[PDB]
Short mmCIF file of C-alpha atoms and ligand atoms in Angstrom, two decimals:
data_model
loop_
_atom_site.label_atom_id
_atom_site.label_comp_id
_atom_site.label_asym_id
_atom_site.label_seq_id
_atom_site.Cartn_x
_atom_site.Cartn_y
_atom_site.Cartn_z
CA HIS E 2 22.67 -17.00 -77.10
CA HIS E 3 21.83 -18.46 -80.60
CA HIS E 4 20.71 -22.04 -79.45
CA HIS E 5 16.94 -21.42 -80.16
CA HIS E 6 17.16 -23.31 -83.57
CA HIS E 7 17.92 -26.64 -81.69
CA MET E 8 14.42 -26.33 -80.10
CA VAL E 9 12.82 -29.75 -79.30
CA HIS E 10 9.16 -30.38 -78.29
CA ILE E 11 9.32 -31.95 -74.80
CA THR E 12 6.37 -33.85 -73.25
CA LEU E 13 6.12 -35.20 -69.69
CA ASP E 14 6.08 -38.97 -69.01
CA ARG E 15 3.12 -39.63 -66.59
CA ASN E 16 4.57 -43.07 -65.67
CA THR E 17 7.69 -41.47 -64.08
CA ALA E 18 5.73 -38.85 -62.07
CA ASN E 19 5.46 -38.79 -58.28
CA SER E 20 1.92 -39.92 -57.45
CA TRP E 21 0.88 -36.42 -56.19
CA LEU E 22 1.65 -34.69 -59.52
CA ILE E 23 -1.07 -33.45 -61.92
CA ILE E 24 0.07 -33.38 -65.57
CA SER E 25 -2.05 -31.54 -68.14
CA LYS E 26 -3.78 -33.36 -71.05
CA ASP E 27 -1.17 -31.96 -73.51
CA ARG E 28 1.64 -33.32 -71.23
CA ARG E 29 3.24 -29.81 -71.23
CA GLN E 30 2.36 -28.61 -67.66
CA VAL E 31 2.77 -30.15 -64.20
CA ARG E 32 1.84 -29.03 -60.68
CA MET E 33 1.77 -30.45 -57.12
CA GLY E 34 -1.66 -31.77 -56.11
CA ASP E 35 -2.96 -31.41 -52.54
CA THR E 36 -3.28 -35.29 -52.28
CA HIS E 37 -2.38 -38.65 -53.99
CA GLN E 38 -3.69 -38.51 -57.59
CA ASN E 39 -5.17 -42.09 -57.58
CA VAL E 40 -2.57 -43.77 -59.85
CA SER E 41 -0.99 -47.24 -59.30
CA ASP E 42 2.63 -47.40 -58.04
CA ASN E 43 5.43 -48.62 -60.34
CA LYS E 44 9.24 -48.91 -60.23
CA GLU E 45 9.68 -45.74 -62.45
CA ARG E 46 7.89 -43.22 -60.14
CA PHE E 47 9.98 -40.82 -58.08
CA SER E 48 8.77 -41.71 -54.50
CA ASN E 49 10.34 -39.09 -52.16
CA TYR E 50 10.12 -35.82 -54.17
CA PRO E 51 7.68 -34.12 -56.62
CA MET E 52 9.77 -35.12 -59.69
CA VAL E 53 8.91 -36.23 -63.26
CA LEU E 54 10.91 -36.92 -66.46
CA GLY E 55 10.35 -35.90 -70.06
CA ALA E 56 9.44 -38.78 -72.42
CA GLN E 57 12.21 -37.86 -74.89
CA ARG E 58 15.62 -39.63 -74.65
CA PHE E 59 18.73 -37.96 -76.08
CA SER E 60 21.98 -39.82 -76.96
CA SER E 61 23.51 -37.39 -79.57
CA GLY E 62 23.27 -33.83 -80.94
CA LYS E 63 22.21 -30.45 -79.65
CA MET E 64 18.82 -29.90 -77.90
CA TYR E 65 17.15 -26.76 -76.46
CA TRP E 66 13.90 -26.20 -74.57
CA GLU E 67 12.32 -23.56 -72.25
CA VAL E 68 10.43 -23.88 -68.97
CA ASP E 69 8.13 -21.29 -67.29
CA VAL E 70 8.73 -20.97 -63.49
CA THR E 71 6.53 -17.87 -62.88
CA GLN E 72 5.71 -17.20 -59.15
CA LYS E 73 7.28 -20.48 -57.88
CA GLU E 74 9.29 -20.40 -54.61
CA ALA E 75 11.11 -23.72 -55.21
CA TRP E 76 11.93 -26.03 -58.18
CA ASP E 77 14.73 -28.08 -59.78
CA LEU E 78 15.32 -28.18 -63.62
CA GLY E 79 17.78 -29.80 -65.98
CA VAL E 80 18.58 -33.26 -67.41
CA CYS E 81 19.44 -36.62 -65.95
CA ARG E 82 20.53 -40.11 -66.95
CA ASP E 83 17.67 -42.46 -67.87
CA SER E 84 18.95 -44.83 -65.09
CA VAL E 85 18.87 -42.39 -62.11
CA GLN E 86 17.60 -43.72 -58.78
CA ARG E 87 13.78 -43.27 -58.39
CA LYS E 88 13.18 -44.51 -54.79
CA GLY E 89 14.42 -43.13 -51.45
CA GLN E 90 16.64 -40.15 -50.62
CA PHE E 91 19.39 -38.86 -52.95
CA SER E 92 21.22 -35.60 -53.79
CA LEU E 93 21.11 -33.95 -57.21
CA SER E 94 24.74 -34.23 -58.44
CA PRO E 95 26.58 -35.31 -61.58
CA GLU E 96 27.92 -38.32 -59.55
CA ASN E 97 24.25 -39.45 -59.18
CA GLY E 98 23.43 -38.69 -62.88
CA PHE E 99 21.85 -35.18 -62.64
CA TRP E 100 22.81 -31.84 -64.31
CA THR E 101 20.44 -29.36 -62.66
CA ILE E 102 19.91 -25.89 -61.17
CA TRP E 103 17.34 -24.94 -58.54
CA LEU E 104 15.61 -22.20 -56.62
CA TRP E 105 15.28 -22.69 -52.81
CA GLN E 106 14.71 -20.09 -50.05
CA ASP E 107 15.29 -17.05 -52.28
CA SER E 108 18.67 -18.33 -53.66
CA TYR E 109 19.61 -20.05 -56.94
CA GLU E 110 22.22 -22.85 -56.92
CA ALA E 111 23.75 -25.30 -59.44
CA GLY E 112 23.52 -29.02 -58.47
CA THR E 113 27.28 -29.67 -58.24
CA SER E 114 28.75 -31.55 -55.22
CA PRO E 115 28.88 -29.51 -53.21
CA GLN E 116 26.32 -27.02 -54.68
CA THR E 117 27.45 -23.78 -56.37
CA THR E 118 25.95 -20.30 -55.72
CA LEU E 119 24.42 -18.69 -58.85
CA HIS E 120 24.48 -14.88 -59.39
CA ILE E 121 21.09 -13.80 -60.84
CA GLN E 122 20.17 -10.04 -60.76
CA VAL E 123 16.81 -10.54 -62.59
CA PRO E 124 14.75 -13.45 -61.07
CA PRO E 125 13.82 -15.59 -64.11
CA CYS E 126 10.22 -16.30 -65.14
CA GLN E 127 11.45 -18.65 -67.96
CA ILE E 128 14.65 -20.78 -68.10
CA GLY E 129 16.30 -22.04 -71.29
CA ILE E 130 18.15 -25.42 -71.15
CA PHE E 131 20.77 -26.32 -73.80
CA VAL E 132 22.39 -29.80 -74.08
CA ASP E 133 25.34 -30.58 -76.42
CA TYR E 134 25.72 -34.37 -76.05
CA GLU E 135 29.02 -34.73 -77.95
CA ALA E 136 30.64 -31.72 -76.26
CA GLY E 137 29.52 -32.84 -72.73
CA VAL E 138 27.78 -29.46 -72.00
CA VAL E 139 24.56 -28.48 -70.18
CA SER E 140 23.84 -24.72 -70.08
CA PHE E 141 21.06 -22.68 -68.48
CA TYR E 142 19.85 -19.27 -69.74
CA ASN E 143 17.69 -16.48 -68.16
CA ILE E 144 15.02 -15.81 -70.86
CA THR E 145 13.59 -12.90 -68.72
CA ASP E 146 17.04 -11.14 -68.87
CA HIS E 147 17.57 -11.33 -72.71
CA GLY E 148 18.95 -14.90 -72.55
CA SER E 149 21.87 -14.15 -70.16
CA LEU E 150 23.94 -17.19 -69.05
CA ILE E 151 23.10 -18.66 -65.63
CA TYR E 152 25.40 -21.70 -65.49
CA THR E 153 27.39 -24.14 -67.71
CA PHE E 154 28.26 -27.70 -66.68
CA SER E 155 31.20 -28.72 -68.87
CA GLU E 156 33.25 -31.93 -69.05
CA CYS E 157 29.96 -33.76 -68.38
CA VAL E 158 30.18 -37.58 -68.22
CA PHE E 159 26.56 -38.42 -69.23
CA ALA E 160 27.29 -42.21 -69.31
CA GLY E 161 23.83 -42.97 -70.78
CA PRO E 162 20.80 -41.60 -72.57
CA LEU E 163 19.56 -38.27 -71.11
CA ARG E 164 15.99 -37.27 -70.18
CA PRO E 165 14.61 -33.81 -69.37
CA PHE E 166 14.24 -33.56 -65.55
CA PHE E 167 11.71 -31.51 -63.46
CA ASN E 168 10.90 -30.99 -59.76
CA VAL E 169 7.85 -28.75 -59.01
CA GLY E 170 8.92 -28.67 -55.30
CA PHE E 171 6.86 -29.13 -52.16
CA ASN E 172 4.17 -26.67 -51.16
CA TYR E 173 4.50 -26.58 -47.33
CA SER E 174 4.32 -22.70 -47.45
CA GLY E 175 1.13 -22.40 -49.55
CA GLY E 176 3.18 -20.12 -51.87
CA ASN E 177 4.54 -22.78 -54.28
CA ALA E 178 1.39 -24.24 -55.95
CA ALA E 179 2.13 -22.77 -59.41
CA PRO E 180 2.96 -25.19 -62.26
CA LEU E 181 6.07 -25.76 -64.33
CA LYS E 182 5.10 -25.22 -68.01
CA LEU E 183 7.00 -26.19 -71.18
CA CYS E 184 6.92 -22.98 -73.30
CA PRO E 185 6.00 -23.01 -76.98
CA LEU E 186 8.62 -22.85 -79.76
O1 K0G Q 1 -1.42 -21.55 -59.92
C1 K0G Q 1 -2.04 -21.88 -60.93
N1 K0G Q 1 -1.95 -21.21 -62.14
C2 K0G Q 1 -0.85 -20.46 -62.63
C3 K0G Q 1 0.13 -19.95 -61.79
C4 K0G Q 1 1.18 -19.21 -62.31
C5 K0G Q 1 1.25 -18.97 -63.66
C6 K0G Q 1 0.27 -19.46 -64.50
C7 K0G Q 1 -0.78 -20.20 -63.99
N2 K0G Q 1 -2.92 -22.93 -60.97
C8 K0G Q 1 -3.54 -23.57 -59.88
C9 K0G Q 1 -2.95 -23.63 -58.62
C10 K0G Q 1 -3.60 -24.28 -57.60
C11 K0G Q 1 -4.83 -24.85 -57.84
N3 K0G Q 1 -5.43 -24.80 -59.04
C12 K0G Q 1 -4.79 -24.17 -60.03
#
């Protein structure tokens, strides 16, 4: 792909983070803590899952960023509406305002309803995410495998401003402590 020149500098929004997340000083890395991180509750925080949003809001144009997923067993990545549900249980679907892919139990799936099997020969260590607001497109790229396409959501009905979306996943296994990291331009 040739989307690299739409690169945007994403930072994480602490106020949206689940209360167990640890976000680095530079707001470019996030991991699951082993306990509550001693923050006050608020209506923005994701309560049920280890999720956080980027601070940036997008309503036009073409945007591209990259995320490092090295050694993680489970995660979700993509974009979502600014007005997605924060509290309680919900599924990641375009009906609920999410355009995402994930790793879970050694398989990769796109967050359609119902979910779609992805075909990845080279497990990615870094994922590229491309949004074309006007075109209604969200695409995912395997940076480890020379930028090969993973998945394209097309005919997207964003219906609002978009924010970068992250889930570091639970760490019940003791094998999923590694962070998500926003990779440098
Ligand atoms: O896993 C960690 N580092 C890392 C992992 C993969 C790639 C790059 C860095 N950090 C960590 C985890 C648990 C407690 N303290 C620190």
